[PDB]
Structures are given as C-alpha cells and as structure tokens.
Coordinates of C-alpha atoms and ligand atoms in Angstrom, one line a residue:
Chain A
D1224 CA 0.0 0.0 0.0
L1225 CA 1.3 3.3 -1.1
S1226 CA -1.7 5.4 0.1
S1227 CA -1.6 4.3 3.8
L1228 CA 0.2 4.9 7.1
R1229 CA 0.6 1.4 8.6
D1230 CA 2.9 -0.1 11.2
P1231 CA 5.8 -1.8 9.6
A1232 CA 5.2 -4.9 11.9
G1233 CA 5.1 -8.1 10.0
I1234 CA 5.8 -6.5 6.7
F1235 CA 9.2 -5.0 7.1
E1236 CA 12.0 -5.0 9.8
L1237 CA 15.5 -3.4 10.2
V1238 CA 18.7 -5.3 10.4
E1239 CA 21.6 -2.9 10.4
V1240 CA 22.6 0.8 9.8
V1241 CA 24.4 1.9 6.5
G1242 CA 25.1 5.7 7.3
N1243 CA 24.0 8.5 9.5
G1244 CA 23.5 11.0 6.7
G1245 CA 18.7 11.0 7.3
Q1246 CA 19.4 7.6 8.7
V1247 CA 19.5 4.7 6.3
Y1248 CA 19.1 1.0 7.2
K1249 CA 19.6 -2.3 5.4
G1250 CA 16.2 -3.9 6.0
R1251 CA 14.2 -6.9 4.8
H1252 CA 10.7 -7.9 3.8
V1253 CA 9.3 -10.2 6.6
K1254 CA 7.2 -12.4 4.5
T1255 CA 9.7 -12.9 1.7
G1256 CA 13.2 -12.1 3.0
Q1257 CA 13.9 -9.6 0.1
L1258 CA 16.4 -6.9 1.1
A1259 CA 15.2 -3.4 1.1
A1260 CA 16.7 -0.1 2.0
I1261 CA 14.9 1.9 4.8
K1262 CA 15.1 5.5 5.7
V1263 CA 14.1 6.2 9.1
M1264 CA 13.3 9.7 10.6
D1265 CA 11.7 11.0 13.7
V1266 CA 8.4 12.7 13.3
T1267 CA 6.2 14.7 15.6
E1268 CA 2.4 14.3 15.6
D1269 CA 2.1 17.6 13.8
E1270 CA 4.1 16.3 11.0
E1271 CA 2.2 13.1 10.7
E1272 CA -0.8 15.1 9.7
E1273 CA 1.3 16.9 7.2
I1274 CA 2.4 13.6 5.6
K1275 CA -1.2 12.6 5.5
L1276 CA -1.9 15.6 3.3
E1277 CA 1.0 14.7 1.1
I1278 CA -0.1 11.2 0.6
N1279 CA -3.3 12.8 -1.0
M1280 CA -1.0 14.7 -3.4
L1281 CA 0.9 11.6 -4.4
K1282 CA 1.0 10.5 -8.1
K1283 CA 1.1 6.8 -9.0
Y1284 CA 3.6 5.1 -11.3
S1285 CA 4.5 1.5 -12.0
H1286 CA 7.9 -0.2 -11.4
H1287 CA 10.7 0.6 -13.9
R1288 CA 14.2 -0.9 -14.1
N1289 CA 16.0 2.4 -13.9
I1290 CA 14.2 3.3 -10.7
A1291 CA 15.0 1.8 -7.3
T1292 CA 11.3 0.7 -6.4
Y1293 CA 9.6 2.8 -3.7
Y1294 CA 7.7 0.3 -1.5
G1295 CA 5.8 2.8 0.6
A1296 CA 5.7 4.7 4.0
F1297 CA 5.2 3.3 7.3
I1298 CA 4.9 4.8 10.9
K1299 CA 6.3 2.9 14.0
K1300 CA 4.5 4.4 16.9
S1301 CA 6.1 5.3 20.2
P1302 CA 4.4 5.9 23.7
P1303 CA 2.1 8.9 24.0
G1304 CA 4.0 12.1 24.0
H1305 CA 7.2 10.8 22.4
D1306 CA 8.2 11.4 18.7
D1307 CA 7.2 8.5 16.5
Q1308 CA 9.2 7.1 13.4
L1309 CA 8.6 7.4 9.7
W1310 CA 9.9 4.6 7.4
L1311 CA 10.5 4.9 3.8
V1312 CA 11.3 1.7 2.0
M1313 CA 12.9 1.1 -1.4
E1314 CA 14.7 -1.6 -3.5
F1315 CA 18.3 -2.6 -2.4
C1316 CA 21.3 -1.9 -4.6
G1317 CA 24.5 -3.2 -3.4
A1318 CA 27.1 -1.9 -5.7
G1319 CA 26.8 1.6 -4.2
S1320 CA 26.4 5.0 -5.9
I1321 CA 27.8 6.7 -9.0
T1322 CA 29.9 9.0 -6.9
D1323 CA 31.4 6.0 -5.2
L1324 CA 32.1 4.6 -8.7
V1325 CA 34.0 7.7 -9.8
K1326 CA 35.9 7.9 -6.5
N1327 CA 36.8 4.2 -6.7
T1328 CA 38.3 4.9 -10.1
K1329 CA 41.9 6.1 -11.0
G1330 CA 42.0 9.8 -11.7
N1331 CA 38.4 10.1 -10.6
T1332 CA 37.1 10.0 -14.0
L1333 CA 35.0 7.5 -16.0
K1334 CA 35.4 6.6 -19.6
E1335 CA 33.2 8.5 -22.0
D1336 CA 31.1 5.5 -23.1
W1337 CA 30.6 4.6 -19.4
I1338 CA 29.2 8.1 -19.1
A1339 CA 27.1 7.7 -22.1
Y1340 CA 25.6 4.4 -20.8
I1341 CA 24.9 5.7 -17.3
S1342 CA 23.4 9.0 -18.5
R1343 CA 21.0 7.2 -20.8
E1344 CA 19.8 5.0 -17.8
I1345 CA 19.3 8.1 -15.7
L1346 CA 17.2 9.6 -18.6
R1347 CA 15.0 6.5 -19.0
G1348 CA 14.3 6.6 -15.3
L1349 CA 13.4 10.3 -15.6
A1350 CA 11.3 9.7 -18.7
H1351 CA 9.1 7.3 -16.6
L1352 CA 8.8 9.8 -13.8
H1353 CA 8.0 12.8 -16.1
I1354 CA 5.5 10.9 -18.2
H1355 CA 3.7 10.1 -15.0
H1356 CA 3.9 13.8 -14.1
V1357 CA 6.5 13.5 -11.3
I1358 CA 9.7 15.6 -10.9
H1359 CA 12.6 13.8 -9.2
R1360 CA 14.1 17.0 -7.7
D1361 CA 17.5 15.5 -6.6
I1362 CA 19.5 14.0 -9.5
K1363 CA 23.2 13.6 -8.6
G1364 CA 25.9 10.9 -8.5
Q1365 CA 24.9 10.2 -4.9
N1366 CA 21.4 9.4 -5.8
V1367 CA 22.1 7.1 -8.7
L1368 CA 22.7 3.6 -7.7
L1369 CA 24.4 0.4 -9.2
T1370 CA 23.3 -3.1 -8.4
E1371 CA 25.4 -6.1 -8.3
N1372 CA 24.6 -6.6 -11.9
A1373 CA 25.6 -3.2 -13.2
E1374 CA 22.0 -2.1 -13.3
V1375 CA 21.6 1.6 -12.8
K1376 CA 18.8 2.8 -10.8
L1377 CA 17.4 6.2 -9.4
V1378 CA 16.9 6.6 -5.7
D1379 CA 13.2 6.8 -4.9
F1380 CA 12.0 7.3 -1.3
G1381 CA 8.7 8.7 -2.6
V1382 CA 9.8 11.5 -4.9
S1383 CA 6.2 12.2 -5.9
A1384 CA 5.4 13.9 -2.5
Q1385 CA 9.0 14.4 -1.5
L1386 CA 8.3 12.8 1.8
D1387 CA 12.1 12.5 2.7
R1388 CA 12.6 16.2 2.3
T1389 CA 9.4 17.5 3.8
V1390 CA 9.5 16.7 7.5
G1391 CA 12.0 15.9 10.3
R1392 CA 13.8 19.3 10.9
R1393 CA 16.0 18.7 7.8
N1394 CA 13.3 20.2 5.7
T1395 CA 14.4 23.6 6.8
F1396 CA 17.9 23.0 5.3
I1397 CA 18.8 24.5 1.9
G1398 CA 21.1 21.6 1.2
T1399 CA 23.8 21.2 -1.4
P1400 CA 23.5 23.6 -4.3
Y1401 CA 25.9 22.1 -7.0
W1402 CA 23.3 20.0 -8.9
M1403 CA 20.5 22.7 -8.8
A1404 CA 19.1 24.3 -11.9
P1405 CA 19.2 28.1 -12.1
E1406 CA 15.4 28.3 -11.8
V1407 CA 15.2 26.5 -8.4
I1408 CA 17.3 29.2 -6.8
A1409 CA 15.8 32.3 -5.6
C1410 CA 17.7 35.4 -6.7
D1411 CA 17.2 38.9 -7.9
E1412 CA 15.8 37.9 -11.2
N1413 CA 13.9 34.8 -10.0
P1414 CA 12.1 35.6 -6.6
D1415 CA 9.9 32.5 -6.8
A1416 CA 12.0 29.3 -7.3
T1417 CA 10.0 27.3 -9.8
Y1418 CA 10.6 23.5 -10.1
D1419 CA 9.9 21.9 -13.6
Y1420 CA 10.5 18.5 -15.0
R1421 CA 13.2 20.0 -16.9
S1422 CA 15.1 20.9 -13.7
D1423 CA 16.1 17.3 -13.6
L1424 CA 17.7 17.4 -17.0
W1425 CA 20.0 20.4 -15.8
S1426 CA 21.0 18.1 -12.8
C1427 CA 21.5 15.3 -15.3
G1428 CA 24.1 17.4 -17.1
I1429 CA 25.8 18.2 -13.9
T1430 CA 25.8 14.6 -12.9
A1431 CA 27.7 13.9 -16.4
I1432 CA 30.4 16.5 -15.5
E1433 CA 30.5 14.8 -12.2
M1434 CA 31.2 11.4 -13.8
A1435 CA 33.8 13.0 -16.1
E1436 CA 35.6 14.9 -13.4
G1437 CA 34.7 13.5 -9.9
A1438 CA 33.0 16.6 -8.8
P1439 CA 30.2 19.0 -10.0
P1440 CA 31.3 22.5 -11.3
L1441 CA 32.0 25.0 -8.5
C1442 CA 32.9 22.2 -6.0
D1443 CA 35.8 24.6 -4.9
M1444 CA 33.3 27.2 -3.9
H1445 CA 31.7 27.8 -0.5
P1446 CA 28.2 26.5 -1.1
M1447 CA 26.5 30.0 -0.6
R1448 CA 28.9 31.4 -3.1
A1449 CA 28.0 28.7 -5.6
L1450 CA 24.3 29.2 -5.0
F1451 CA 24.9 32.8 -5.9
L1452 CA 26.9 32.0 -9.0
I1453 CA 24.8 29.4 -10.5
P1454 CA 21.9 31.5 -11.9
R1455 CA 24.6 34.2 -12.9
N1456 CA 27.4 32.2 -14.5
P1457 CA 27.0 31.2 -18.2
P1458 CA 26.4 27.4 -18.4
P1459 CA 29.2 25.4 -16.9
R1460 CA 31.6 23.3 -19.2
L1461 CA 34.0 20.3 -19.0
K1462 CA 37.5 21.5 -18.1
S1463 CA 39.4 19.2 -20.5
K1464 CA 39.3 19.3 -24.3
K1465 CA 40.0 15.6 -24.6
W1466 CA 36.3 14.7 -24.8
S1467 CA 34.4 14.0 -27.9
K1468 CA 32.4 16.5 -29.8
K1469 CA 29.1 14.4 -29.0
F1470 CA 30.0 14.7 -25.3
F1471 CA 30.4 18.5 -25.2
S1472 CA 27.0 18.8 -27.2
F1473 CA 25.3 16.7 -24.8
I1474 CA 26.5 18.6 -21.7
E1475 CA 25.5 21.9 -23.6
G1476 CA 22.1 20.2 -24.4
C1477 CA 21.3 19.7 -20.7
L1478 CA 22.9 22.9 -19.2
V1479 CA 20.6 25.5 -21.0
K1480 CA 20.3 28.2 -18.4
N1481 CA 16.5 29.2 -19.1
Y1482 CA 14.5 26.1 -18.4
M1483 CA 11.8 27.3 -21.0
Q1484 CA 14.4 26.6 -23.8
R1485 CA 15.9 23.4 -22.3
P1486 CA 14.8 20.1 -24.2
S1487 CA 12.6 17.5 -22.6
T1488 CA 13.7 14.0 -21.6
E1489 CA 12.4 12.6 -24.9
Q1490 CA 14.6 14.9 -27.0
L1491 CA 17.7 14.1 -24.9
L1492 CA 17.2 10.4 -25.2
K1493 CA 17.7 11.0 -29.0
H1494 CA 20.9 12.9 -28.6
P1495 CA 23.6 11.1 -30.6
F1496 CA 25.8 10.8 -27.4
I1497 CA 22.9 8.9 -25.7
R1498 CA 21.3 7.4 -28.7
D1499 CA 24.4 5.8 -30.4
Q1500 CA 26.2 3.4 -28.1
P1501 CA 27.9 0.8 -30.2
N1502 CA 30.1 -0.5 -27.3
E1503 CA 27.1 -0.9 -24.8
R1504 CA 27.4 -4.5 -24.3
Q1505 CA 31.2 -4.3 -23.6
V1506 CA 30.5 -1.5 -21.3
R1507 CA 27.8 -3.3 -19.3
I1508 CA 30.6 -6.0 -18.9
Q1509 CA 33.4 -3.4 -18.0
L1510 CA 31.1 -2.2 -15.2
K1511 CA 30.3 -5.7 -13.9
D1512 CA 34.1 -6.3 -13.7
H1513 CA 34.7 -3.1 -11.7
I1514 CA 32.0 -3.9 -9.3
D1515 CA 33.5 -7.3 -8.6
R1516 CA 37.1 -6.4 -8.1
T1517 CA 36.0 -3.7 -5.8
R1518 CA 34.1 -6.3 -3.6
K1519 CA 37.3 -8.3 -3.0
Chain B
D1494 CA 47.5 21.9 16.5
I1495 CA 46.1 18.4 16.5
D1496 CA 47.2 15.6 14.0
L1497 CA 44.6 13.0 13.1
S1498 CA 47.2 10.2 13.1
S1499 CA 48.1 10.4 16.9
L1500 CA 44.4 10.0 17.9
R1501 CA 43.7 6.9 19.9
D1502 CA 40.7 4.4 19.6
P1503 CA 38.1 5.3 22.0
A1504 CA 37.6 1.7 23.3
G1505 CA 37.5 1.4 27.2
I1506 CA 37.7 5.3 27.3
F1507 CA 34.2 6.4 25.9
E1508 CA 31.2 4.5 24.8
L1509 CA 28.2 5.8 22.8
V1510 CA 24.7 5.3 24.5
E1511 CA 22.1 6.8 22.1
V1512 CA 21.8 9.3 19.4
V1513 CA 20.6 12.5 20.9
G1514 CA 20.8 15.0 18.0
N1515 CA 22.6 16.2 14.9
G1516 CA 25.5 18.5 14.0
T1517 CA 26.4 20.6 10.9
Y1518 CA 28.6 17.5 9.9
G1519 CA 28.2 14.5 12.2
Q1520 CA 25.7 12.7 14.4
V1521 CA 25.8 13.6 18.1
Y1522 CA 25.6 11.0 20.8
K1523 CA 24.8 10.9 24.4
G1524 CA 28.2 9.3 25.3
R1525 CA 29.7 8.0 28.5
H1526 CA 33.2 8.0 30.0
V1527 CA 33.7 4.4 30.8
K1528 CA 35.8 4.6 33.9
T1529 CA 33.7 7.2 35.7
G1530 CA 30.3 6.9 34.0
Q1531 CA 30.3 10.6 33.6
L1532 CA 28.4 11.9 30.7
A1533 CA 29.8 13.5 27.4
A1534 CA 28.3 14.4 24.1
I1535 CA 30.2 12.7 21.3
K1536 CA 30.2 13.9 17.7
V1537 CA 30.6 10.9 15.4
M1538 CA 32.0 12.1 12.0
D1539 CA 33.0 9.8 9.2
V1540 CA 36.5 10.9 8.0
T1541 CA 36.3 11.1 4.2
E1542 CA 39.0 12.6 2.0
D1543 CA 36.9 15.6 1.1
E1544 CA 35.7 16.5 4.6
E1545 CA 39.0 15.6 6.2
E1546 CA 40.3 19.2 6.7
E1547 CA 36.8 20.4 7.9
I1548 CA 37.0 17.9 10.6
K1549 CA 40.6 18.9 11.6
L1550 CA 39.5 22.5 12.0
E1551 CA 36.5 21.8 14.2
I1552 CA 38.8 20.0 16.7
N1553 CA 41.3 23.0 16.8
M1554 CA 38.7 25.6 17.4
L1555 CA 36.7 23.7 19.9
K1556 CA 40.0 22.8 21.7
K1557 CA 41.4 26.3 21.9
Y1558 CA 38.2 28.4 22.4
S1559 CA 36.0 26.3 24.5
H1560 CA 37.5 27.5 27.8
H1561 CA 34.6 29.6 28.9
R1562 CA 31.4 28.8 31.0
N1563 CA 29.2 29.7 28.0
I1564 CA 31.0 27.5 25.5
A1565 CA 30.5 23.7 25.9
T1566 CA 33.9 22.4 26.9
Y1567 CA 36.2 20.2 24.7
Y1568 CA 37.2 16.9 26.3
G1569 CA 39.1 15.0 23.6
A1570 CA 39.3 13.5 20.2
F1571 CA 39.4 9.9 19.0
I1572 CA 39.4 7.8 15.9
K1573 CA 37.6 4.5 15.6
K1574 CA 39.3 2.8 12.5
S1575 CA 37.2 0.7 10.1
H1576 CA 38.3 1.9 5.4
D1577 CA 36.0 4.8 6.3
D1578 CA 37.2 5.9 9.7
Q1579 CA 35.1 7.5 12.4
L1580 CA 36.3 10.4 14.4
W1581 CA 34.9 11.0 18.0
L1582 CA 34.8 14.6 19.1
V1583 CA 34.1 14.6 22.9
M1584 CA 32.7 17.3 24.9
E1585 CA 30.8 18.5 27.9
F1586 CA 27.3 17.0 27.8
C1587 CA 24.5 19.5 28.2
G1588 CA 21.6 17.3 29.5
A1589 CA 18.6 19.7 29.2
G1590 CA 18.8 19.8 25.4
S1591 CA 18.5 23.0 23.3
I1592 CA 16.7 26.3 23.6
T1593 CA 14.5 25.4 20.5
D1594 CA 13.5 22.2 22.5
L1595 CA 12.7 24.3 25.6
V1596 CA 10.4 26.7 23.9
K1597 CA 8.5 23.8 22.0
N1598 CA 8.2 22.1 25.4
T1599 CA 6.7 25.2 27.1
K1600 CA 3.1 26.0 27.2
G1601 CA 2.0 28.2 24.2
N1602 CA 5.6 28.0 22.9
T1603 CA 6.9 31.1 24.5
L1604 CA 9.3 31.9 27.4
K1605 CA 8.9 34.6 30.1
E1606 CA 10.6 37.7 29.1
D1607 CA 13.1 37.3 32.0
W1608 CA 14.0 33.9 30.9
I1609 CA 14.8 35.5 27.5
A1610 CA 16.9 38.2 29.1
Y1611 CA 19.0 35.6 31.0
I1612 CA 19.5 33.2 28.2
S1613 CA 20.4 36.0 25.6
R1614 CA 23.0 37.4 28.1
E1615 CA 24.6 34.0 28.5
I1616 CA 24.6 33.7 24.7
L1617 CA 26.2 37.1 24.4
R1618 CA 28.9 36.4 26.9
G1619 CA 29.9 33.2 25.1
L1620 CA 29.9 35.3 21.8
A1621 CA 32.0 38.0 23.3
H1622 CA 34.6 35.4 24.4
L1623 CA 34.9 34.2 20.8
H1624 CA 34.9 37.6 19.2
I1625 CA 37.7 38.8 21.5
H1626 CA 39.6 35.7 20.2
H1627 CA 38.8 36.8 16.6
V1628 CA 36.3 33.9 16.1
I1629 CA 32.9 34.3 14.7
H1630 CA 30.4 31.5 15.5
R1631 CA 28.4 31.9 12.2
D1632 CA 25.7 29.4 13.2
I1633 CA 23.9 30.9 16.2
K1634 CA 20.4 29.5 16.5
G1635 CA 18.2 28.0 19.1
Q1636 CA 19.4 24.5 18.1
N1637 CA 23.0 25.3 19.0
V1638 CA 22.3 27.0 22.3
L1639 CA 22.1 24.3 24.9
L1640 CA 21.1 24.0 28.6
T1641 CA 22.8 21.8 31.2
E1642 CA 20.7 20.0 34.0
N1643 CA 21.5 23.0 36.2
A1644 CA 20.0 25.6 33.8
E1645 CA 23.5 26.8 32.6
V1646 CA 23.8 28.0 29.0
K1647 CA 26.3 26.7 26.5
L1648 CA 27.2 27.4 22.9
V1649 CA 28.0 24.4 20.6
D1650 CA 29.1 23.7 17.0
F1651 CA 32.2 25.3 15.5
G1652 CA 31.2 23.5 12.2
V1653 CA 30.5 26.4 9.9
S1654 CA 33.0 28.8 12.0
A1655 CA 35.8 27.5 9.6
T1656 CA 29.3 21.5 0.9
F1657 CA 25.7 21.7 2.5
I1658 CA 23.9 24.9 3.2
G1659 CA 22.0 24.7 6.6
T1660 CA 18.9 26.5 7.9
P1661 CA 18.8 30.1 6.7
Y1662 CA 16.3 31.6 9.2
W1663 CA 18.9 32.9 11.7
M1664 CA 21.3 34.3 9.0
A1665 CA 22.2 38.0 9.0
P1666 CA 21.3 39.9 5.6
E1667 CA 25.0 40.4 4.9
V1668 CA 26.0 36.7 4.8
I1669 CA 23.6 36.2 1.9
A1670 CA 25.2 36.9 -1.5
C1671 CA 23.4 39.1 -4.1
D1672 CA 24.1 41.6 -6.7
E1673 CA 25.1 44.6 -4.5
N1674 CA 26.6 42.1 -2.0
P1675 CA 28.3 39.6 -4.4
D1676 CA 31.0 38.5 -1.9
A1677 CA 28.8 38.2 1.2
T1678 CA 31.1 40.4 3.3
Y1679 CA 30.5 40.1 7.0
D1680 CA 32.1 40.4 10.5
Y1681 CA 31.5 39.4 14.2
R1682 CA 28.2 41.3 14.1
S1683 CA 26.7 38.5 12.0
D1684 CA 26.2 36.6 15.2
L1685 CA 24.4 39.5 17.0
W1686 CA 21.7 39.4 14.4
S1687 CA 21.5 35.7 14.9
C1688 CA 21.2 36.2 18.6
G1689 CA 18.2 38.7 17.9
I1690 CA 16.5 35.9 15.9
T1691 CA 17.2 33.4 18.6
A1692 CA 15.4 35.9 21.1
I1693 CA 12.5 36.1 18.8
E1694 CA 12.5 32.4 18.5
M1695 CA 12.3 32.2 22.3
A1696 CA 9.5 34.7 22.3
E1697 CA 7.3 33.2 19.6
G1698 CA 8.4 29.6 19.3
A1699 CA 9.8 30.0 15.8
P1700 CA 12.1 32.4 13.9
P1701 CA 10.6 35.1 11.5
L1702 CA 9.8 33.8 8.0
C1703 CA 9.3 30.3 9.5
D1704 CA 6.1 29.8 7.3
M1705 CA 8.3 30.3 4.2
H1706 CA 10.2 27.9 2.2
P1707 CA 13.8 28.1 3.3
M1708 CA 15.0 29.1 -0.3
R1709 CA 12.2 31.8 -0.1
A1710 CA 13.5 33.0 3.2
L1711 CA 17.1 33.3 1.7
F1712 CA 15.7 35.7 -0.8
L1713 CA 13.6 37.7 1.5
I1714 CA 16.1 38.2 4.5
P1715 CA 18.3 40.8 2.7
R1716 CA 15.3 42.6 1.2
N1717 CA 13.0 42.6 4.2
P1718 CA 12.9 45.3 7.1
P1719 CA 14.4 44.2 10.5
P1720 CA 11.9 41.6 11.8
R1721 CA 9.7 42.6 14.7
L1722 CA 7.9 40.7 17.5
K1723 CA 4.3 40.1 16.7
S1724 CA 2.8 40.9 20.2
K1725 CA 2.5 44.3 22.0
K1726 CA 2.8 42.7 25.4
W1727 CA 6.7 42.7 25.7
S1728 CA 8.5 45.5 27.5
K1729 CA 10.1 48.6 25.8
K1730 CA 13.5 47.1 26.8
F1731 CA 12.9 43.8 24.9
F1732 CA 11.8 45.6 21.7
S1733 CA 14.8 47.9 22.0
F1734 CA 17.1 44.8 22.5
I1735 CA 15.7 43.1 19.4
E1736 CA 16.0 46.3 17.4
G1737 CA 19.6 46.4 18.4
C1738 CA 20.4 42.9 17.3
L1739 CA 18.6 43.4 14.2
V1740 CA 19.9 46.6 12.6
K1741 CA 19.6 45.8 8.9
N1742 CA 23.0 47.3 7.9
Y1743 CA 25.8 45.6 10.0
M1744 CA 27.8 48.8 9.7
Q1745 CA 25.8 50.4 12.4
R1746 CA 24.8 47.4 14.3
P1747 CA 26.2 47.6 17.9
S1748 CA 29.1 45.5 19.0
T1749 CA 28.8 42.5 21.3
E1750 CA 30.2 44.7 24.1
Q1751 CA 27.4 47.4 23.5
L1752 CA 24.6 44.8 23.6
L1753 CA 25.9 43.5 26.9
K1754 CA 25.4 47.0 28.2
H1755 CA 21.8 47.1 26.9
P1756 CA 19.4 47.5 29.8
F1757 CA 17.5 44.5 28.7
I1758 CA 20.7 42.4 29.0
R1759 CA 22.4 44.4 31.9
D1760 CA 19.5 45.0 34.4
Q1761 CA 18.4 41.6 35.6
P1762 CA 17.1 41.7 39.2
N1763 CA 15.3 38.4 39.1
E1764 CA 18.3 36.5 37.7
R1765 CA 18.5 34.2 40.9
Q1766 CA 14.8 33.4 40.6
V1767 CA 15.1 32.7 36.9
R1768 CA 17.8 30.0 37.2
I1769 CA 15.4 28.2 39.7
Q1770 CA 12.3 28.5 37.5
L1771 CA 14.5 27.3 34.6
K1772 CA 15.9 24.3 36.7
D1773 CA 12.4 23.4 37.7
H1774 CA 11.1 23.5 34.1
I1775 CA 13.9 21.1 33.1
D1776 CA 13.1 18.7 35.9
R1777 CA 9.3 18.7 35.1
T1778 CA 10.1 17.8 31.4
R1779 CA 12.5 14.9 32.2
Ligands
3D9_2412 C1 18.5 16.3 24.2 C2 18.8 16.5 22.9 C3 20.2 16.9 22.8 C4 21.1 17.1 23.8 C5 22.4 17.5 23.5 C6 23.1 17.8 22.3 C7 24.3 18.3 22.6 C8 25.4 18.7 21.8 N1 25.3 18.8 20.4 C9 26.2 19.3 19.5 C10 27.6 19.3 19.7 C11 28.5 19.8 18.7 N2 28.0 20.1 17.5 C12 26.7 20.1 17.3 C13 25.8 19.7 18.3 N3 26.6 19.0 22.4 C14 26.7 18.9 23.7 N4 25.8 18.5 24.5 N5 24.5 18.1 23.9 C15 23.4 17.7 24.5 C16 20.6 16.7 25.0 C17 19.4 16.3 25.4
NA2413 NA1 33.7 26.0 29.1

C-alpha cells in the first residue's frame, strides 16, 4: 500500500545501519526475506498530519528498471507524548552509488562510453517519472545507484510527494547547491523558485560533468557562493578538451540556463551521445568487472 | 595543532549510548566516560578525504576556544578505525537539550521575558569570548544553544565557523550573497543578528519567516526590514534589544560589548529566581 500509514510490523524490519547521513538501514521484507533500503526519521504528531496531506498529493507510477522501487511509507509509533518514526522503503542496490564509482576509479574520471551508458539509464528513469507527471528533484551521483549486476537505478524514497525532504527538521535546510538548476534558486531575477520536470535535465548534465571529473562544477566554492553564481554564470563546461564533440554537445544540451528553452527528456534520449552506443554490451561488462574487483 | 594520526581508539575510554541529535557535519551521541560513568556528548563524524580538513578545524577551534562557561567544553578527540574511519569529538554533555527544544516544550511556545533576558545574556557572553579571540560562530540559532541540567547556558558547534547549506532563518542579511553584495562580506556582528532571531524564537516559538520555504527565506532576508515581535505585550526594553540585534546594515549594528550594556541584558534583578524557574522547568520535562 502506497496510500496508507501502517505499522511496519510483519511486513518490514530493520537489520543494520548503513550511514548516519537521514538515517538509512539495510532492511528486509518479513514475508519474503527480500532485502530493502529503509530511511528512518523521527516525526512529531504535527508532521504526521502533514504527511497525510502529502499522501493525497501523491501520483502513481509503475515499477521501472531504472528506478529503485519505492515500496511505501510506514509509521512505527512510540509511547504517547514521544516522537514516532517514519519509514520509507526502497529496493536494495549493493554496488553503491555513481559517486562511489567515480571515487573508486583512478584519476576520478569515468570513460566517456561509461558516461553515455549511465546517463541514458538516468534519462530513461526520468522519462518514466516525467510521463507520470513527477519531478525527481534530486538528481546527482550520490542518488544514482548500481546493483550487483551493473543495473543503474535512481533513488526513490517517494519522490512524488518528497516525503524525505518535507519533515524531520531537515526540511528547513537549503542543502547542497551544486546540482541545482538556475530556476530552483531564488535570486534577484527569479524571486519564486519554480521547479519543472526540466530541472532534472540540468541536474542530469551536472551529473555527467561529475562522472567526467569526479566533482560537479564550482565544488571549490563555498556553497553559498556557488548558489549565488549558478543563476549568474554562463552554463558550466567540461575543463578538459579531450572529450568527444558528442559529449560536449550533450552537456550543452542539458545545461541550457533558461528552463523554458531546455529540451525534454524525450529529446535528450535521442541525442547522438545517448542514442548511439556501439560498445554498450562491452561497457555493461566492463562495469560488472569493476563492481566485482571492488568487492574483494 | 592536532594531528589525526596520533588520535587513539576510544575503546575502554568512551562508549556511545544513544543518538541525541545532529551536527552541521556528524551525528551527536549521548556518550559515556567508561571509567567514571560521567556523561559526554560525542560527535561522530566519518573521515572522508573531502571532509578531512573540515573535521581537523572543528577539533582545533573547539579545543582552543571552549574554555569559557558559556562554551561547551572540549574533552578530547578519538578515531575508531574501520576503510572509512570514524572520528569521535568529545565534549561537555548538556543534559537539558536545546533552546529550540525548551520553547517547544513550554506551554504556548513562549518563554517569560526574564528567561529570555538571562538566556540571551549567556549567549552574548559566550559570543564576546569568541569575538575577542577573533572567532565568529556563524551558526547561532536555538538549536545550537544548549542547557545543562543546572540551567547553565552553553554554545555548541564550530562546524561552519571555519558543501551543504544549513537552515537560513537565523542568517544575517550580509552573509547572503546578492548583486550589490556579491562576496557576502560580514564580520563578528553577524552573530548578533542571529542572537536577535534566537530571542524572537524564544518569544514566539519560531524564527521570523518560519512559514516560508527556506529558499524563499534566503531571498527575503536581505530585502525585508528588520523583523519585529508580533505581540505588543513585551517591554520597551525587549523591543529595543531586538531592534539592536537586528539593525539591517551591519555597519551600524552595535558590538557584542554594546549589547551586553543594553538595559534588557544588563539589568536583571530576578536572575537568581530565573535560574530556579528554569531548573524546575527542566526537571518537570524529564
Ligand atoms: C536532548 C537533545 C540533545 C542534547 C544534547 C546535544 C548536545 C550537543 N550537540 C552538538 C555538539 C556539537 N556540535 C553540534 C551539536 N553537544 C553537547 N551536549 N549536547 C546535548 C541533550 C538532550
Ligand atoms: Na567551558
């Protein structure tokens, strides 16, 4: 059930922590022993009403192989007066993130045809979200996961209502600015930060720079300074001239400043850099190897 | 200065009990000194290559500048090796939680004006100590102002004193970059603004602009007039203290020393009684 607020008892249970940060657990399905990732946050009773409202605002969308499947939201109550707990459950991916991938690679840079393959998977996941009228809102290397089969999946802890960004005294945080499109940043020219499905495509382009260089543009900058520069700077660029013409054009394709003039997911899926991948099979293999030697 | 290599494993020295809160970077635990049972707050930060120097700095500032009754005292630092090592930053445990906590657990989410005068003064004394050492806290807010079980007031978190942007609601106008302020130039008086907002938080239960999206608050703060208390009940002194913390242009905002001489801060006759009222309120919430 994706429209309810049940107790996780008998359906899901926690086994061990992964990282402190939201707090993420390695969990399991009780009735089938299937592994799942579970985000656990403390919520007040005032916030629980807020998430009831947001469950109403949810949009439905089927499973999709480029999205880590969102299994639903649960609440594990505590004694009267104390803060309860919100669980957000999602498919488990054991090969880590794309950021881990680029860090666990010599020179902190991926091969261009790896970037092409990964970028296309992100786009296909996003096409599925956008065609069902949902913005992802947080595309970056950290939020793109590899499975133990070189499958690339977007993190979904309920992106439709953004439940993991809306409550738990972390919702008052501005967060990391490096993957933000110009239009989501309030500034002198844009007093109301509009979010659009095309915001994801800017972040997608930033994620491509991240794969290519290990870090998003302006990573050397204090985050408040970057937030100021992003709506003001011309579109960011790859530092090195080593890259193919197709790659530069794709980056330029994503990073159109004015979102009204930025292409849709469908258009970018047809971009020659994304569309024409002759070494795809070998790349899927190459990634499998990299995941395996890392595990030893 | 400290070197991360020399740091010992915490085993048999400190043990973690339970997560008690968060930091700018790192989870905060109610920890325990194994040999004596004495409590300590422990900040558990994962030592990555990117955040490796940010951690080093938080140790050094906490170590050198926490020798003042209004700064939560540095105990020591430890590393618990794993290949993603954990660093344990150990300091004085403030049992009563935060100011934000206090107001939200008080009836009608507001504190008596003389609780606010005492608490704000303690904040200002800790701040004066930092400023005279040429340190700017940079993240003063109710969540970083703590209370011990004895109603003592202590400043924590030198995290942003030296990649994520935190909450904006307590930021001074001058730390927010914009066209006529492209480099976000600011001084020690940034903290005094934040102290004003913290006082408003004690008075109303939330900072100004709390109903706004944080990104929208970031845009508004440099454009909006100084925030004002909603109610007309407060004294003339309190209004004037808030006005003084919240001078829009930091160039003519009073210094920490000047605000300590503000009658609202300076003249506290019921101080003795306030500490008792506060102590009681902490006990009735436990
Ligand atoms: C209930 C909730 C939180 C506390 C608490 C948090 C801290 C703390 N937190 C931080 C320390 C350093 N940096 C950020 C936070 N430091 C020192 N004591 N303490 C007590 C107590 C009761
Ligand atoms: Na001290």
